[PDB]
């Protein structure tokens, strides 16, 4: 997250870290058994880390749970990042508490201008590299579809939306991929892609979660 702020320990209790020997992506807990992330975060041997603040220090509220299975969306296209969504099942159910909590799925899309909370452990610099140890947060509005498509002509599908600031300086980053965009108490987006981070007229692009709720519900019910 570039241009954001330190969230505060466990203030985003649905935020998970995906670990394969190191943090590599975010995710969101959607019930005690299931995490949603980005398909471009797929790899084998994922351990889900819940209750994290400082990802480099055991602080006492963590749960580390191996994934038993990962399911990439059937229509995921790695060339265009269309349908950039994946589900991860936990080998054992998480223990829900004030620091480890699920986020509700949306019933409908959010309107342009709605304020959202974006979070993750990604790079905090727009040109250089500096990775934080504690969770970072950004408040960012949903941008109009026209401003989103104007920024990325030929590249935005109906399964994507933009959020952030056309003036730059505030964006998600590499390392935030797969993490949540939460608006009005619902998981509206997944950190997906963008043109670098915090550049001018190139806002962040996010998977449009509301388009996938039927697939999420059917897939988790059958797995």
Q: Which one of the listed residues 84, 119, 176, 192 is annotated catalytic?
A: 84
Query: How does DSSP classify residue 209?
Result: G
Burial 88-114, CB ≥16 within 10 A → b, else e: bbbeeebeeeebbbbbebbeebbebee
Asked if residue 150 lies in contact with residue 15, where contact means CB atoms within 8 angstroms, the answer is no
133 is catalytic: no
Q: Which residues are annotated as a binding site for substrate?
A: 171-172, 174-175, 177
Which position among 17, 37, 70, 177 bears the catalytic label?
A: 177
Known catalytic residue at 53 = no
8 Å CB contact between 160 and 77: no
CB 116 within 8 A of CB 181: yes
Residue list for the binding site: 52, 54, 57, 62, 171-172, 174-175, 177
Catalytic residue among 17, 23, 40, 53: 40
List the binding residues for Ca(2+).
52, 54, 57, 62
Q: H helices within 34-127, ranges in order?
A: none
The yes-or-no answer on residue 68 being catalytic is: no
The continuous run of DSSP H or E covering 126 comes out as none
Catalytic (active-site) positions: 40, 84, 177
């Amino acid at each position: 997250i570039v241009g954001g702020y330190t969230c505060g320990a466990n203030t985003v209790p649905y935020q998970v870290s995906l670990n394969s020997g190191y943090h590599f992506c975010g995710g969101s807990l959607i019930n005690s058994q299931w995490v949603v992330s980005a398909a471009h975060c797929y790899k084998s041997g994922i351990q889900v880390r819940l209750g994290e603040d400082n990802i480099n220090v055991v602080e006492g509220n963590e749960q580390f749970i191996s994934a038993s299975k990962s399911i990439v969306h059937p229509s995921y296209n790695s060339n265009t990042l269309n349908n950039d969504i994946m589900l991860i099942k936990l080998k054992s159910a998480a223990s829900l508490n004030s620091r480890v909590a699920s986020i509700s799925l949306p019933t409908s899309c959010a309107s342009a201008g709605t304020q959202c909370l974006i979070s993750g452990w990604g790079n905090t610099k727009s040109s250089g590299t500096s990775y934080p140890d504690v969770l970072k947060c950004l408040k960012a509005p949903i941008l109009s579809d026209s401003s989103c498509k104007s920024a990325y002509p030929g590249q935005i599908t109906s399964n994507m939306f933009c959020a952030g600031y056309l003036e730059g300086g505030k964006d998600s980053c590499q390392g935030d991929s797969g993490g949540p965009v939460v608006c009005s108490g619902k998981l509206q987006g997944i950190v997906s892609w963008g043109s670098g981070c915090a550049q001018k007229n190139k806002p962040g692009v996010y998977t449009k979660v509301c388009n996938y709720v039927s697939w999420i519900k059917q897939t988790i019910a059958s797995n």
